[PDB]
Amino acid sequence: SMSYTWTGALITPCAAEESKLPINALSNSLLRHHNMVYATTSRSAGQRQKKVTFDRLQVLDDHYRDVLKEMKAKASTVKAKLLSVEEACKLTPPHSAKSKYGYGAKDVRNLSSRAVNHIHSVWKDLLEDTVTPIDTTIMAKNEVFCVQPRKPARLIVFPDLGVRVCEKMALYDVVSTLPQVVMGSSYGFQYSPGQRVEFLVNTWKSKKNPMGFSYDTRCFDSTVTENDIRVEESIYQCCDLAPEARQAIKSLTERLYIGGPLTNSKGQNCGYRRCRASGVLTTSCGNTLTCYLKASAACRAAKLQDCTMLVNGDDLVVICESAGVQEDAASLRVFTEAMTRYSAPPGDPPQPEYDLELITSCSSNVSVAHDASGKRVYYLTRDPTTPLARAAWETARHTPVNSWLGNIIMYAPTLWARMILMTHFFSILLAQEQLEKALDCQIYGACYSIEPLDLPQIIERLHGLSAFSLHSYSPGEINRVASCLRKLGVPPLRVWRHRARSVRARLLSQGGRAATCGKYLFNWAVKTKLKLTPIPVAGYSGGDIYHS
Ligand SMILES: CNC(=O)c1c(-c2ccc(F)cc2)oc2cc(N(c3ccc(B(O)O)cc3)S(C)(=O)=O)c(C3CC3)cc12
């Protein structure tokens, strides 16, 4: 079974595409080496098509079926509800792609009679027809990166707006509640970053002689087979469901999730999909369940002892009891052989690690700093190259997703988010008097509208109060940041400290919520520190989900 078949019609853009970093009067203050930053476009879509197109063979053994049966037993305890049209409508992002049938996301959100009527007709059709493949649009994503001695565009596959609202009706409650019940503490999207870090540290310490590894499947969405998507459905069907929900889920599975025709932005047939669609409601939950199933079975095949898995989408980490360096290495090759039999070979082979900090997953690693009292605090960080490249782009261009804001929220304890992103963007917001303006950003795939003035409260909840007083960062973390700054031609950390003092003073001058940002976000910038006191579920990547 080929992941895709192609007609030769091109994957076309829906608008003008920029590959070159836009420059304005603020650009050079952040980043001087402009030619290092680029955006992917549909021009590289052909390259990605080649990468994502391959045959999938699957060999399923008793370990696989044993794990599945256990997963189904837990799924059978879940009771999920149907969302009303209105509930589903309110989960639709304001800027979500408009329907081909004469309405858009704002119409959906307002419960306009044209939108609601069409949605009712799509629902009725799902109930009555379980065979006809549902159309999807295929597009090239425009994403910004730094060059490394260029990545081709990622592809997004999604159905019409009316269908997307129907998916929410049938499955939003399922994808929100089932993964945690089936996978327990292994379901990664249940955690805030602070909770995630705590869970990783505690898990590592729970082993007598800990060993851990990341496993990254090559082109995971393309590795997902018809079997995998039917197995996912069978898990969902274990739930206590409304009869209408059961029918819609079956219909969606047969008609959309298993596969279907691919249409470009110009309406031309591009080919056919027999793998995971990247832009459906079930992408995150389906990938997580499938990765967990295959990985759990593979742990058993490799006889890994006292495994604790952490899984979110296609990202996987296993922490377990070491049997010794030589035996661990052998056991990972067996793990990999099993995963490969299940259709999920790795991009690069997994490596056993005997220090938590040497494991990288979702581009991130655990590092250590110290709070106000000198106590060790663990936090998740990453290489700041991509965040800074996207910050540079967003300095010069308004974009639908404000990666900078998401990065500040999710990487708030990091030296680079605090010193560079907070300083740079608060300066911009001050200049435009836009501190109070809500902005769109992404947390675990779901879209959120967030006012920058609420960052202190948000950071405290996701990371704890220590996120505003961390110091004595590791030499390795400091060196990675500094090295990234030289690479991109970003001013050194000393310059950012100086700018932050100014930004802080400006925020304090404003009083109110602005002053609170000054006090908490920039306490690191001042010599004599002000005493800081407390301030008064699931993943949905590609799921077209919104919250305010
Ligand atoms: C299975 N892997 C893991 O659980 C994660 C490890 C990891 C685990 C073990 C280990 F040893 C090292 C890292 O670190 C993580 C960090 C995050 N975070 C984000 C990562 C990437 C993006 B982005 O490029 O879209 C956004 C958030 S976060 C909020 O904590 O900083 C996540 C989030 C998606 C859920 C998972 C893991």
Gaps in the chain after residue (C–N beyond 2.5 Å) = 149, 536
Q: Which helix or strand (DSSP H or E) is residue 488 part of?
A: helix 475-488
Please report, for residues 131, 333, 346, 392, the alpha-carbon distance to residue 349 in angstroms, rounded to integers and kept in the order given. Answer: 40, 8, 6, 34
Burial class of residue 176 (count of CB atoms within 10 Å of its CB; 0-12, 13-18, 19+): middle
Q: Whose CA is nearest to atom 36 of ligand 1?
A: 362
Q: Whose CA is nearest to atom 6 of ligand 1?
A: 361
User: In the numeric block, which tokens belong to residue 31?
Assistant: 């980043």
Task: Tell me the CA–centroid distance for residue 537 and ligand 1, in Å.
Answer: 15
DSSP at 111: T
The residue segments making up the domain with residue 85 are 56-132+160-183+225-258+275-281
Pick the atom of ligand 1 nearest to 312's CA. 1
Task: Indicate the residue among 216, 244, 274 that finishes a domain.
Answer: 274
Task: Tell me the CA–centroid distance for residue 356 and ligand 1, in Å.
Answer: 14
309 three-state secondary structure: strand
Task: Tell me the CA–centroid distance for residue 380 and ligand 1, in Å.
Answer: 8
Closest CA to 151 of 54, 53, 43, 223: 43
Q: Whose CA is nearest to atom 25 of ligand 1?
A: 444
Q: Confirm or deny that 216 is annotated as ligand binding.
A: yes
Task: Indicate the residue among 339, 362, 385 that finishes a domain.
Answer: 362
Closest CA to 209 of 380, 353, 379, 366: 353
Closest CA to 434 of 452, 420, 447: 452
Q: Whose CA is nearest to atom 35 of ligand 1?
A: 189
Distance CA 213, CA 319 (A): 7
Ordered DSSP codes for 3-25: SEEE-S-----SS----BPP--T
Closest CA to 49 of 136, 137, 138: 138
Task: Tell me the CA–centroid distance for residue 262 and ligand 1, in Å.
Answer: 31
Whether residues 310 and 421 fall in one domain: no
DSSP-H helix ranges across 129-192: 161-183
Between the two ends of the chain, the Cα-to-Cα distance in Å is 42
Q: Which residues contact 433 (CB under 8 A, 6 or more apart)?
A: none
Burial class of residue 402 (count of CB atoms within 10 Å of its CB; 0-12, 13-18, 19+): buried
Task: Tell me the CA–centroid distance for residue 337 and ligand 1, in Å.
Answer: 25
Angle between helices 512-521 and 455-463 (to 10 degrees): 40
Q: Whose CA is nearest to atom 26 of ligand 1?
A: 444
Whether residues 189 and 320 fall in one domain: yes
Pick the atom of ligand 1 nearest to 212's CA. 11
Q: Whose CA is nearest to atom 24 of ligand 1?
A: 362
Pick the atom of ligand 1 nearest to 196's CA. 30
Whether residues 350 and 376 fall in one domain: no
Task: Tell me the CA–centroid distance for residue 264 and ligand 1, in Å.
Answer: 32
PDB resolution in Å = 2.0
Please report, for residues 42, 43, 52, 182, 430, the alpha-carbon distance to residue 46 in angstroms, rounded to integers and kept in the order given. Answer: 8, 7, 10, 38, 43
Q: Tell me if 85 sits within 8 A of 120, measured CB to CB.
A: yes
Ordered DSSP codes for 150-164: -PPPPEEEE--HHHH
Total domains, the chain: 4
Whether residues 377 and 525 fall in one domain: yes
Apex CA 298: angle with CA 294 and CA 304, to 5°? 140
Whether residues 425 and 520 fall in one domain: yes
Q: Confirm or deny that 454 is annotated as ligand binding.
A: no
φ, ψ dihedrals at 296, nearest 5°: -65, -45
User: In the numeric block, which tokens belong to residue 482?
Assistant: 């500094």
Torsion of CA 507, 510, 512, 518, to 10 degrees: 10
- Binding pocket residue ranges, ligand 1, CB within 6 Å: 188-189, 193, 196, 200, 310-312, 315-317, 356, 359, 361-366, 380, 410-411, 444
Burial class of residue 340 (count of CB atoms within 10 Å of its CB; 0-12, 13-18, 19+): middle
Task: Tell me the CA–centroid distance for residue 193 and ligand 1, in Å.
Answer: 8
Distance CA 59, CA 55 (A): 13
The pairing of beta strand 446-450 with beta strand 546-547? parallel
Q: Which residues contact 372 (CB under 8 A, 6 or more apart)?
A: 466, 469, 529, 532
Closest CA to 407 of 394, 457, 26: 394
Task: Tell me the CA–centroid distance for residue 289 and ligand 1, in Å.
Answer: 17
Pick the atom of ligand 1 nearest to 360's CA. 12
Q: Tell me if 285 sits within 8 A of 175, measured CB to CB.
A: yes
Whether residues 374 and 466 fall in one domain: yes
359 three-state secondary structure: coil
SS3 content of the chain, % helix, strand, coil (to 5): 50, 15, 35
Q: Which residues, in sequence order, are bridge partners of residue 217?
A: 346
Q: Tell me if 507 sits within 8 A of 426, measured CB to CB.
A: yes
Q: Whose CA is nearest to atom 23 of ligand 1?
A: 362
Pick the atom of ligand 1 nearest to 188's CA. 4
Closest CA to 212 of 348, 88, 339, 304: 304
Q: Tell me if 74 sits within 8 A of 182, measured CB to CB.
A: yes
Closest CA to 231 of 248, 253, 216: 253
Distance CA 145, CA 330 (A): 36
**Residue from 186, 317, 364 whose mutation best tests the ligand 1 pocket (most atoms within 8 A of CB):** 364
Q: Whose CA is nearest to atom 21 of ligand 1?
A: 362
Whether residues 428 and 536 fall in one domain: yes
316 three-state secondary structure: strand
Burial class of residue 106 (count of CB atoms within 10 Å of its CB; 0-12, 13-18, 19+): middle
Q: Which residues, in sequence order, are bridge partners of residue 449?
A: 440
Q: Tell me if 522 sits within 8 A of 503, measured CB to CB.
A: yes
Distance CA 236, CA 175 (A): 9
90 three-state secondary structure: helix
Task: Indicate the residue among 324, 342, 362 that finishes a domain.
Answer: 362
Q: Tell me if 322 sits within 8 A of 209, measured CB to CB.
A: yes
Closest CA to 226 of 264, 270, 183, 272: 272
Whether residues 84 and 109 fall in one domain: yes
CA atoms within 13 A on the CB side of 275: 24
Whether residues 154 and 267 fall in one domain: yes
Torsion of CA 391, 395, 399, 403, to 10 degrees: 20
Distance CA 548, CA 143 (A): 24
Q: Which residues contact 340 (CB under 8 A, 6 or more apart)?
A: 346
Whether residues 346 and 458 fall in one domain: no
Burial class of residue 20 (count of CB atoms within 10 Å of its CB; 0-12, 13-18, 19+): exposed
Q: Whose CA is nearest to atom 3 of ligand 1?
A: 361
Instruction: For the beta carbon of residue 517, count every other beta carbon within 10 angstroms.
Output: 24
Q: Which residues contact 179 (CB under 8 A, 6 or more apart)?
A: 187, 189, 285, 288, 289, 538
Q: How many helices (H) and strands (E) does the chain have?
A: 21, 15
548 three-state secondary structure: coil
Task: Tell me the CA–centroid distance for residue 314 and ligand 1, in Å.
Answer: 11
Whether residues 323 and 377 fall in one domain: no
Q: Which residues contact 78 (CB under 8 A, 6 or more apart)?
A: 174, 177, 178, 181, 182, 238, 239, 240
Instruction: For the beta carbon of residue 330, count every other beta carbon within 10 angstroms.
Output: 13
Sign of CA dihedral 38, 40, 46, 51: positive
- Please state the length of the chain: 548
Whether residues 137 and 234 fall in one domain: no
DSSP E strand stretches across 258-314: 260-263, 269-273, 305-312
Distance CA 42, CA 292 (A): 33
Q: Which residues contact 15 (CB under 8 A, 6 or more apart)?
A: none
